[PDB]
Amino acid sequence: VVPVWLIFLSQYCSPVVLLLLVAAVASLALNEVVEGVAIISIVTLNACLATYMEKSSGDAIGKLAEKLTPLQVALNKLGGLIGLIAIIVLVVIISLAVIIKYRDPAHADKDPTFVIIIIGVGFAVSSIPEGLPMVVTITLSAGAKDMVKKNANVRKLPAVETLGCCSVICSDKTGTLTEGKMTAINAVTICKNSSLSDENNKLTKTFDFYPTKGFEPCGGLFDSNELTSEKKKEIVIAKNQNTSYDKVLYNYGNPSNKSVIVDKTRSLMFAAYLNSYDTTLSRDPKTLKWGIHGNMSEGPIVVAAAKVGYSFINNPNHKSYLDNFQRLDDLEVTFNSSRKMKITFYKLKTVNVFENVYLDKPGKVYTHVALIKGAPDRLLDRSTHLLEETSMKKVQVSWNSTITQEERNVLIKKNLELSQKALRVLSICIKPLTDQNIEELKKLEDADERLKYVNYDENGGFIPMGYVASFDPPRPGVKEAIQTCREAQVKVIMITGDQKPTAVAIGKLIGLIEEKSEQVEDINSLAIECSELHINKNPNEPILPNDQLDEFTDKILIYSRAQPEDKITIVQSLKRKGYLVAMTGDGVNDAPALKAADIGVAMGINGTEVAKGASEMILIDDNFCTVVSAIDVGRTIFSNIQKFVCFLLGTNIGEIIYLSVAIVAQMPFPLEALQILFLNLMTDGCPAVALSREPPNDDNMKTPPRPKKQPIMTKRWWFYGILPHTIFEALCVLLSLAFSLYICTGFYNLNGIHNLCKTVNLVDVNDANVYHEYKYFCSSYEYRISTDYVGWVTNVSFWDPQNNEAVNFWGAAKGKVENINPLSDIVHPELRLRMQDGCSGDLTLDENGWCRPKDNKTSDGYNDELEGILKKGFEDVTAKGSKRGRTMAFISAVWCEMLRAYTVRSWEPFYKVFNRNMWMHLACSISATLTFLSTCIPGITSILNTTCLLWWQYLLAIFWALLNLFLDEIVPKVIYRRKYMTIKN
Amino acid sequence: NDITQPRIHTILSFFFPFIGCLSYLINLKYPEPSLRRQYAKKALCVGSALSVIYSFILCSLLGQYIYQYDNKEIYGYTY
């Protein structure tokens, strides 16, 4: 893996961190290092959190399933663009504030240009989205962890991003949509001139197995037309008893019922069972749960056989019975997707009889039998003779008459009916053989690929005895998952190897094809066989032209009779149509299809190593429904980043707006140099990062899939969310600052505060007509809330004649006073007593009796302890009142940006989803606690330049932020709800 | 899966608010539907709300009885 130190160092290369480091040059330039250092602190904290989450994603990915994600690089570009725009706007605003001779009522000892430049630098550091890469990394890593928690192991980080935008899912029917536990349901016996049949056809009859629970062997065979639910449930009753189902109804599987029909059913089941030597029934060693070993498709035949006998559990003598029939391994035909049948050979223990079914042929003795099982559509067409019932004594092969076209149709429409009801049908055939026939078969130079001698013969030796129908139960949650996919407007396509009527039936059962689609032929409009994907309608022709294929298959929903290698064409067609294809497979031959797909999906435990190595994600759940939850989580991962970017823009544009308005309207700047860095750290990082862990919205699984080209900010997030929050936040913060300064110092604009302080000019000594400037008195009006008195008071600063130094006097007189005259009765007796004796020595007393130096007091020592004068840097009551007002404005700004985190989370009103996330509660309260503590800790307040407020002052500062929560309860999220969240007008 | 210790952490958080957040931080490993994690969520909410309220009250008292009275300056009415 990448070294941890290398990962930590690499994260400084993102454009936003680079811009912040550019602003960190102030620590080296002639500026305040104690405020430029905090930028490095913020960057280091973000880098530490991001490197921890990246290292943890390096663990959750790779080892659990076996450099920037395109979303990450796009969002880094977006963050760089936002930073550049903010820097340009703040450069214009700061140059405007410098061309104008702007200055603060406080900071009198410092050069105004440097102060405003540092404030602009702080605003730039705030407005640049330095937390964007960190939040994107956290969201992607937490999303991958959530996927793993929901049984979806993503192999690549880019897979998490791409899943949300996915618009089509292609899944195999078997294993993914329906569990592999196939169980037998019906079995059909074929024998013409039979005494018993269905609908008086006198040629075929259907039988039903019961019980049909998964892979459980005990049970029997009954008549389909007679077994209603009432008679079935009583058969289920007392099933723990020994085999006695004949007390309810005739059990054809009981060997004690030696009859002609039972003989034919036994012959068919024994022919089926001998083809299943690769599979065997078993039971778990620690639980009384049955199971199967070997091929999954061959499984239900053995279970079906056990219900009529032919099993070791029913009788220990079955081993010898199987041993009596030796097997010819040389001629065995293996089963594969290309042949679609398997042929097995055995020797008989008799001359010309097989399970009381006679193969008598003059001049020939049949010491061997060839058994075939496979799809009916590739064995029925080559059938030559059927079984025939002679009188009421025995069943013998009908060598006298071949199968006619009507006789073939007799089997054909029964196969059509049985292939419906979501049952797949297997056809079993036989051919009697002799020693010379076995020698001829062994003399064939061809491999087990063809063995054409078995199917075709001049004597017509090929007999199909009947069918076995087995159900493939859908997984319990597949219907709800497909309904959710339909609500999410993601197309679901089933790819299966079953026959076409079976495919359409199972699709209708699980809900791919609704009954509302019967207005058109669903038989051909959506469900088609793979033979249709060629210009000539047969697999011999290689392909059908793309310009017609893409238009033909855009309506198709179910593919039947598929092949593993054909999945490539489907993926190509869907990709050309514009969908983001997530295709599932096992990897035996469809690994290229998975790789060419946008989101390859390995089929978990059933999947091979090639599939797991070619896919983007692995379904350890072995279930289709996990893909739907995967899409849900992938959508949530983008939605959380969208909410975070909305928070960033909606707060960091309002910051610039209210700074610009304060500068334009000649107000004191609403935030200090480092107060805004503290604000940035207390509203991004916390709680803005806590938006990364938001649970899915109620409509994130209902909206259409997001196109890849769609920008992160649709105009829906601009007309609501960003702009109406920036305007409201600017209004709230500016009104808070104005009311704050009016409460704390009696004036809300810089001109009023500066004129509120009285100044005197002193003509220089060495320079003619040059004038220095000093202040000799200050006033202020501060609102008071107390038990004794509520209302305005006046506070003054003056040169104290008793102590011979500049002092601050608070609460000189009740109510606002235009000119404080200390000799009047309004003034507090202490202040009157302190100066009633007159000015100290060489000072003036004409103007209201304040201590102003005479006009000849000038010295070259500017502010060098001149008597009758407050020193530069002394905290006048105007300066202290302005600091208190700016502290209230700062707390209001923090609680206005922080409270936006509680209304960004969902378009629903915030009171419904308040408790939905706990990390946001932790981060929000950390922000609030550090805001309250940063204005009362003695160390912190000395560098933040904040003063600790009164209780009602804190409530007043917070209330201007709760007024910004009318962004939810009034406008505009109510407008958004009425326009889009309303189901119907 | 024990409900007792998150409840103890919730009660103890009334005397030190940082304890409530530590409660949620420590037992995040346990499954979400368990009663222990639900009481941990309650502990985090109680700790966070008490942290905000206690910071407000502590800071207001500290201001009104220390920072309101700078030693060297003079005070008159309503002071």
Is A936 close to B62, i.e. CB distance below 8 A? yes
Question: Taking the mean position of all CA atoms in its chain, how far away is CA A236?
Answer: 45
Q: What share of chain B is helix, strand, coil (3-state, %, to 5)?
A: 65, 5, 35
Span(s) in chain A for CATH 1.20.1110.10: 4-149+632-745+882-981
- B68 min Cα distance to partner chain A (Å): 8
- A693 min Cα distance to partner chain B (Å): 14
Contacts of residues A916-920 at CB distance under 8 Å and 24 or more positions apart, as own/partner, are A916/A694, A916/A695, A917/A690, A917/A693, A917/A694, A917/A695, A918/B24, A918/B41, A918/B44, A918/B45, A919/A690, A919/A693, A920/A687, A920/A690, A920/A691, A920/A693, A920/A694
User: What is the spatial distance between Cα A876 and Cα A885, in angstroms, rounded to a whole number?
Assistant: 14
Closest CA to A675 of A899, A332, A947, A903: A947
Is A809 close to B74, i.e. CB distance below 8 A? yes
Identity (one letter) of the amino acid at A323? D
User: What is the spatial distance between Cα A621 and Cα A605, in angstroms, rounded to a whole number?
Assistant: 9
- B23 min Cα distance to partner chain A (Å): 12
To one decimal, the resolution in angstroms is: 3.8
Question: In this structure, are strands A558-560 and A527-529 parallel, antiparallel, or unpaired?
Answer: parallel
Say which residues have a Cβ less than 8 Å from residue A827's Cβ, sequence separation at least 6.
A812, A813, A820, A821
Enter the tokens of residue A561: 């009779």
SS3 A46: helix
Q: Please answer whether residues A592 and A620 qualify as being in contact, where contact means their C-beta atoms are separated by less than 8 angstroms.
A: no
Preceding amide of A695 cis, omega within 30? no
Q: Please answer whether residues A776 and A851 qualify as being in contact, where contact means their C-beta atoms are separated by less than 8 angstroms.
A: yes
Is B55 close to A932, i.e. CB distance below 8 A? yes
User: What is the spatial distance between Cα A412 and Cα A43, in angstroms, rounded to a whole number?
Assistant: 75
Check whether domain A4-149+632-745+882-981 has CATH 3.40.50.880, yes or no: no
Within 8 A of B32 by CB-CB distance, chain A residues are none
Say which residues have a Cβ less than 8 Å from residue A744's Cβ, sequence separation at least 6.
A782, A783, A881, A882, A884, A885, A888
Q: How far is CA A616 from CA A148, A343, A594, in A?
A: 13, 39, 9
* CATH code of the domain occupying A183-471: 3.40.1110.10
Q: Which of B18, B30, B48 to substitute to test the interface with A, most A CBs within 10 Å?
A: B48
Q: Please answer whether residues A592 and A568 qualify as being in contact, where contact means their C-beta atoms are separated by less than 8 angstroms.
A: yes
Closest Cβ opposite residue B75 in set A811, A814, A932: A811
Within 8 A of B68 by CB-CB distance, chain A residues are 950
Enter the tokens of residue A781: 């009006």
Phi, psi angles (nearest 5°) of residue A327: -115, 140
Task: Please indicate if any CB of chain B lies within 8 Å of the CB of A773.
Answer: no
Q: How far is CA A177 from CA A297, A481, A873, in A?
A: 16, 10, 78
Largest CA distance in chain B: 61
Q: Please answer whether residues A566 and A153 qualify as being in contact, where contact means their C-beta atoms are separated by less than 8 angstroms.
A: no
Closest CA to A342 of A455, A439, A460, A263: A455
User: What is the spatial distance between Cα A505 and Cα A239, in angstroms, rounded to a whole number?
Assistant: 32
Within 8 A of A812 by CB-CB distance, chain B residues are 76-77
Check whether domain A153-178+473-622 has CATH 3.40.50.1000, yes or no: yes
Say which residues have a Cβ less than 8 Å from residue A954's Cβ, sequence separation at least 6.
A891, A932, B56, B59, B60
Contacts of residues A707-710 at CB distance under 8 Å and 24 or more positions apart, as own/partner, are A707/A165, A708/A165, A708/A580
Within 8 A of A936 by CB-CB distance, chain B residues are 58-59, 62-63, 67
Beta bridge pairs of residue A154? A617
Closest CA to A348 of A364, A324, A331: A324
User: What is the spatial distance between Cα A702 and Cα A918, in angstroms, rounded to a whole number?
Assistant: 25
Task: Please indicate if any CB of chain B lies within 8 Å of the CB of A936.
Answer: yes
Within 8 A of B55 by CB-CB distance, chain A residues are 928-929, 932-933
Starting at the edge strand found earlier in the chain, the sheet holding A353-354 runs: A353-354, A357-358, A394-397, A387-390
Q: What H or E segment, with its residue span, contains residue A264?
A: helix A260-274
Is B55 close to A789, i.e. CB distance below 8 A? no
Give first-to-last CA distance, chain A, whole Å. 55
Interface A–B counts its CB contacts (< 8 A) at 96
Q: Which of A790, A920, A936 to substitute to test the interface with B, most B CBs within 10 Å?
A: A936
User: What is the spatial distance between Cα A309 and Cα A220, in angstroms, rounded to a whole number?
Assistant: 9
Residue where the block lists tokens 């001109």: A751
Residues in chain A: 985
Span(s) in chain A for CATH 3.40.50.1000: 153-178+473-622
Enter the tokens of residue A493: 């396509």
Span(s) in chain A for CATH 3.40.1110.10: 183-471
Closest residue in B to A919 (Cα) is: B44
Is B55 close to A810, i.e. CB distance below 8 A? no
Is A932 close to B59, i.e. CB distance below 8 A? yes
Within 8 A of A786 by CB-CB distance, chain B residues are 78
User: What is the spatial distance between Cα A452 and Cα A448, in angstroms, rounded to a whole number?
Assistant: 9
